[PDB]
Amino acid sequence: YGDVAIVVYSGQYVENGVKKNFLPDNTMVLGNTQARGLRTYGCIQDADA
């Protein structure tokens, strides 16, 4: 759309008995495709490891 890519996301995560939606009813996110996001993993707290 001009110089802005458009993507439609309809995801489903199921909790309790029924499945829900990721995004709210009708929202829109203005963001960059080169954004920086960090995947951080903590320390395990069990004896065996």
Add this chain to the structure above:
Amino acid sequence: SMYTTAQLLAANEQKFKFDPLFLRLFFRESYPFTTEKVYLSQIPGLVN
């Protein structure tokens, strides 16, 4: 003891339209079974 004449020119056969699309498109595999009953099974795939 009749003297009149007759002639047959054309004799059509009218037929009704019939085309199996639901059976042709979807039901493609046939499995004849020699037993008394058939088991069909499903398993859910939802996770908390």
